[PDB]
Amino acid sequence: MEEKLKKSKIIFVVGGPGSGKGTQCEKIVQKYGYTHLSTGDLLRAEVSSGSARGKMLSEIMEKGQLVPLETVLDMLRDAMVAKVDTSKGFLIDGYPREVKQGEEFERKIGQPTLLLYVDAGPETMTKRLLKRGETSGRVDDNEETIKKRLETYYKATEPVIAFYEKRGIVRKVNAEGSVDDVFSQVCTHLDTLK
């Protein structure tokens, strides 16, 4: 299972909050048939579970503490193994988030074959974020999250990108345009896969 994983096709999809990285991922899975994994999607399902894991998390969260990187990575390992005999590839949404977190993933799971960098400029993600707030009921008064979420991304995230191009695996998509025209670009990179 060490090797079966290491040879698996792993694509990190990294980009700012509101860059449109989920929708892209959902078109990849429809096209390509890859396995699409979001951390907050695992987190959510863990919680619902009622696992002993699902509960340590719930409770550290409700204290409003930050979830620990090894449990997140554990969670992710399990889910990749569980699909490894059957899957075409793994699609990993918003991850890493911190350079050392991309370090932990290669050690404990496997190397990424590709890093999909969904690049959108600031007003594009902010907008997309304003609209997504209405869409969910989020009463928010403040641009303290938009503003702050963005800031933290450029701060922690944009340095994953630099770590990555050293290895020659990053491929950037301009994320302005339709979902179809951004996806058009994704196809390009996805095509040279394997």
Domain count, the chain: 1
Does the annotation list 132 as a binding residue?
yes
Q: Which domain holds residue 81?
A: 1-194
Does the annotation list 149 as a binding residue?
yes
Does the annotation list 96 as a binding residue?
yes
The answer to whether residues 73 and 108 touch, using CB atoms and an 8 Å cutoff, is yes
Q: Which amino acid is at 45?
A: A
Does the annotation list 128 as a binding residue?
no
CATH number at residue 12: 3.40.50.300
What is the experimental resolution, given in Å to one decimal place? 2.1
Method: X-ray
Does the annotation list 65 as a binding residue?
yes
Does the annotation list 177 as a binding residue?
yes
Does the annotation list 67 as a binding residue?
yes
Does the annotation list 68 as a binding residue?
no
Does the annotation list 19 as a binding residue?
yes
Task: Compute and round to an integer the Cα radius of gyration of the chain.
Answer: 17
> How many CA atoms within 13 Å lie on the side-chain side of 34?
27
Does the annotation list 171 as a binding residue?
no
